[PDB]
Design a protein around this ligand. Structure first.
Ligand code: CL
Ligand code: CL
Ligand code: CL
Ligand code: NA
Ligand code: NA
Lengths: 163, 165
């Protein structure tokens, strides 16, 4: 009753649906066979082979609960762009002299939409963006004069129309 | 009785001092409450409370302040001397860790900026995400993002690399 009879296995395939299917299968097996969280944690290494086994050897001390073991599998194997990479790319290029504010804001908010969904509110997102705006706009627009991207775009478009 | 600030003894000239701003806001909130002035009327009468730079400032922003609450938030935002968050982020991302900057002084310079943002805005995981891309390849070869959870972990692992090299 520790997964020694379980026919599900995971080798480290970096495929979201494969990871969710595996996690779903072992949660079901655990529930149907009446395995405790503590025993599921002590037996989970029986379900890994290849790269997943080498991986588990490296992280198992971090998994103090069954729930943390499941979170480690999702975090490590479900593929995503690392947040640190998104921030670096966000700060890599300032707004050009001839790039209008709408397309500049679209591209930047597109990078912000790659970060975890609940992490930043619109105020924080505006703070991240505001320093990259062209000096042409910041001469007219105080950070304290805008609360939303829509406020910023409304003032920026007026500036563009008056050139 | 009063419907305006004509009997208020408090005024603000634009001193960029957090304690002065909070004292002024507290004093006009007390007067407003004692005289039973509504939010809407306090906003219509607020210009009497400003002189000098604060008067010129208010002339320039008053259209943005559609409520008393928004007026008070604009005073706090404009007169509390702080580096604005957007400038903190730009300065943070301006310099990568050089080949000769060790982990202690790199982390200290970056924490000096992060400590100027609102205390509850970013948890340590988010602060490490902001930092990690700026770390020199000397550290990133040996230190995986998934392997550090705290600045203490990062400092401990970076010092081992330095002790070896
Ligand atoms: Cl079993
Ligand atoms: Cl006062
Ligand atoms: Cl501060
Ligand atoms: Na302005
Ligand atoms: Na407003």
């Amino acid at each position: 009753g520790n997964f020694s009879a379980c026919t599900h296995s995971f080798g480290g395939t970096r495929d979201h649906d494969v990871v969710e299917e595996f996690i779903g299968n072992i949660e079901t097996y655990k529930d149907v066979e009446g395995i405790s969280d503590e025993n599921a944690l002590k037996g989970i290494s029986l379900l890994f082979y290849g790269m997943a086994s080498t991986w588990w050897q490296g992280v198992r001390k971090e998994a103090t609960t069954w729930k943390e073991a499941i979170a480690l599998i999702r975090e490590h194997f479900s593929p995503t762009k690392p947040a640190y990479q998104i921030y670096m790319e966000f700060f890599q290029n300032k707004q050009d002299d001839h790039d209008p504010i709408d397309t500049f804001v679209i591209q930047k908010r597109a990078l912000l939409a790659q970060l975890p969904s609940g992490r930043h509110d619109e105020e924080t997102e505006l703070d991240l963006l505001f320093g990259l705006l062209n000096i042409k706009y910041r001469k007219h627009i105080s950070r304290h004069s805008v609360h939303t991207f829509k406020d910023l775009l409304e003032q920026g478009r007026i500036i563009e129309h008056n050139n």
